[PDB]
């Protein structure tokens, strides 16, 4: 008989199966549609999630009740050290899909990138790319490289570059990994020859996040969500708990199927892996593209709040540390825990809405301690409130007498 009352089904059947992701890193399953009338440019970048804070800004949206008013919006900080381009790959169309034509490697490759080919680099022979380096720059090597580049010019419809992160530049004590994360970055815009020219000029060179994304733009995030291991139907699917009287347990689905079909359907909620799934999240507005603190210390200082502060809150980002490189400040949240590597992609959805076209100007960036209820914005403000303490007096008098 028909169900007594109707309610929408629990969960999205299009995110199936709810299994552990193949890779910890975010990977773009598709790139934004290529438009040849534009200049050649990179379509993606790799960042590291540092932490979260919130900002204050004025909304410019006529007809809204918050127009010309201040709002508080949570933001996510992601450290973005420069990427290094080491390879060029070309793709040609076939009736069975895209095929790689070849790979042009940079003549000199970083130790970081070569560590990705090993499980124990420190105890290994460290011979990666040694034969390739010797073969290159020879008469046969130069002809082979020209052969591959001409094959790209003649047959390739898609040109992508091979880029790796710099864990040495990301001087983080909690990430642990020292082998570089490697991803293919598509080159969109222009002709194939123009794409090849840009890729060649980018070989062995560094790429900054400000060269791929602008300040007030929006972007897509490819990342893997936080893991939770085995989880019951209540948390994994959001099914309602059974009454307290239920014998043998109440965190279950009562009926997992009718008599016929004499089977359990794939649409029924079951216990299993929750989290650690790859997600592509749309329309994450970039609120700030900050430079390295070593280049400009005042990262969280605005024209409205003139306090000299960095993006790192007092006490550091919990479990991450200090943001020491360039960073991207995205409105809202992104999938995945801190320290996880993530892929920022140029948006694939249309960017014509007023919200997506609004120019973002920040008036306040919170830098209070994320441990406890932070009530100070800077070290100086805390010292002004407390004044001299017992430890400070002991230190100052010892320096005055014993050392001066």
Residue list for the binding site for Mg(2+) = 263, 370
Asked if 227 touches Mg ion (CB under 5 A), the answer is: yes
What residue ranges in 213-271 does DSSP mark as E strands? 218-224, 227-231
**Which residue positions form the known binding site?**
263, 370
Nearest to 293 by CA among 318, 311, 305, 307: 311
Residues pairing with 85 in the sheet: 163
CA 60 to chain centre: 28
Quick count: other Cβ atoms within 10 Å of Cβ 231? 15
Helix (H) or strand (E) holding 92: strand 83-94
Name the residue nearer to Mg ion (CB basis): 231 or 358: 231
Asked if 292 touches RNA (CB under 7 A), the answer is: yes
The number of residues making up the chain comes to 404
CB 326 within 8 Å of CB 291: yes
Q: Minimal distance in Å, beta carbon 321 to other proteins?
A: 16
User: Quick one: tokens of 229?
Assistant: 């291991």
Q: Minimal distance in Å, beta carbon 296 to other proteins?
A: 11
Binding-site member from 201, 240, 384, 398 for RNA (CB under 7 A):
240
Q: Minimal distance in Å, beta carbon 123 to other proteins?
A: 6
Of 205-213, 323-331, 341-349, 367-375: span binding Mg ion (CB under 5 A): 367-375
Of 35-43, 173-181, 192-200: span binding RNA (CB under 7 A): 173-181
Residues pairing with 348 in the sheet: none
Site of interaction with other proteins (CB under 8 A) = 120, 123-125, 294-295
Asked if 111 touches RNA (CB under 7 A), the answer is: yes
Mention every residue, 6+ apart, whose C-beta is less than 8 A from residue 107.
133, 136, 137, 204
Asked if 37 touches K ion (CB under 5 A), the answer is: no
Mention every residue, 6+ apart, whose C-beta is less than 8 A from residue 381.
none
CB 209 within 8 Å of CB 42: no
Of 34-42, 188-196, 285-293: span binding RNA (CB under 7 A): 285-293
Binding-site member from 37, 96, 306, 402 for RNA (CB under 7 A):
96
Q: Tell me which residue has tokens 């929408």.
A: 8
Q: Minimal distance in Å, beta carbon 227 to K ion?
A: 20
Residues 124-163 that bind RNA (CB under 7 A): 124-134, 136-139, 142-143, 146-148, 150, 162
Q: Minimal distance in Å, beta carbon 124 to other proteins?
A: 7
User: Which partner in RNA, Mg ion, other proteins, none is near 277 (CB below 5 to 8 A by kind)?
Assistant: RNA
DSSP string computed for 94-154: ETTEEEEEEEEE-SS--HHHHHTT-SSSTTS---TTHHHHHHTTSHHHHHHHHHHHHHHHH
Q: Minimal distance in Å, beta carbon 173 to other proteins?
A: 13
Residues 237-296 that bind Mg ion (CB under 5 A): 247
Name the residue nearer to other proteins (CB basis): 111 or 308: 111
Binding-site member from 35, 37, 254, 303 for RNA (CB under 7 A):
254
Mention every residue, 6+ apart, whose C-beta is less than 8 A from residue 136.
105, 107, 142, 145
Question: Beta 70-79 vs 218-224: how paired, if at all?
Answer: unpaired
User: Quick one: tokens of 111?
Assistant: 């130790």
Q: Minimal distance in Å, beta carbon 295 to other proteins?
A: 8
Q: Minimal distance in Å, beta carbon 315 to other proteins?
A: 19
Instruction: Give the span between the Cα atoms of 115 and 361, in whole angstroms.
Output: 41
Residues 295-334 that bind Mg ion (CB under 5 A): 321
The residue sitting closest to K ion, measured at its beta carbon, is: 1
Residues 1-20 that bind K ion (CB under 5 A): 1
User: Which partner in K ion, Mg ion, RNA, none is near 215 (CB below 5 to 8 A by kind)?
Assistant: none
Binding-site member from 213, 278, 328, 329 for RNA (CB under 7 A):
278
Residues pairing with 186 in the sheet: 160
Residue 34's alpha-carbon distances to 40, 102, 128, in angstroms, are 10, 21, 34
Binding-site member from 191, 214, 297, 363 for RNA (CB under 7 A):
297
């Amino acid at each position: 008989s028909h169900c007594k009352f109707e309610h929408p089904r629990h969960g999205h059947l299009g995110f199936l199966p709810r299994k552990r992701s193949r890779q910890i890193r975010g990977r773009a399953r598709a790139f934004p549609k290529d438009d040849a009338t534009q200049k050649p440019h990179l379509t993606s970048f790799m960042v590291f999630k540092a932490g979260m804070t919130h900002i204050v800004r004025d909304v410019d949206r006529p007809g809204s009740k918050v127009n010309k008013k201040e709002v508080v919006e949570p933001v996510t900080i992601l450290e973005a050290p420069p990427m290094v381009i080491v390879g060029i790959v070309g793709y040609r169309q076939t009736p069975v899909g895209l095929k790689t034509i070849g790979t042009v490697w940079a003549h000199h490759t970083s130790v970081e990138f070569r560590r990705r080919y090993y499980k124990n680099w420190k105890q290994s022979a460290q011979l990666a790319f040694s034969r390739q380096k010797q073969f290159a720059n020879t008469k046969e090597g130069k002809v082979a490289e020209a052969r591959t580049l001409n094959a790209f010019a003649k047959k390739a419809s898609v040109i992508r570059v091979i880029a790796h992160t710099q864990l040495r530049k990301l001087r983080n004590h909690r990430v642990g990994v020292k082998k570089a994360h490697v991803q293919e970055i598509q080159v969109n815009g222009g002709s194939v020859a123009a794409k090849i020219a840009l890729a060649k000029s980018l070989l062995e060179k560094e790429v900054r996040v400000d060269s791929v994304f602008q300040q007030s733009e929006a972007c897509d995030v490819c990342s893997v969500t936080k893991g939770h291991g085995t989880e019951g139907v209540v948390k994994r699917w959001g099914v309602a708990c059974l009454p307290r009287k239920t014998h043998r347990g109440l965190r279950k689905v009562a009926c997992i199927g009718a008599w016929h079909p004499a089977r359990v359907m794939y649409t029924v909620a079951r216990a299993g892996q929750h989290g650690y799934h790859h997600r592509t999240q749309l329309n994450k507005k970039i609120y700030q593209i900050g430079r390295s603190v070593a280049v400009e210390p005042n990262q969280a200082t605005t024209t409205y709040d003139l306090t000299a502060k960095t993006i790192t809150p007092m006490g550091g980002f919990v479990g991450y540390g200090t943001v020491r490189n360039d960073y991207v400040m995205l409105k809202g949240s992104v999938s995945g825990p801190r320290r996880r590597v993530m892929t920022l992609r140029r948006p694939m959805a249309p960017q014509t809405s007023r919200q997506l076209k609004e120019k973002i100007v920040l008036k306040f960036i919170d830098t209070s301690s994320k441990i406890g209820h932070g009530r100070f914005q800077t070290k100086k403000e805390k010292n002004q409130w407390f004044g001299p303490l017992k430890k400070d007096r002991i230190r100052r008098e010892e320096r005055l007498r014993k050392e001066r």
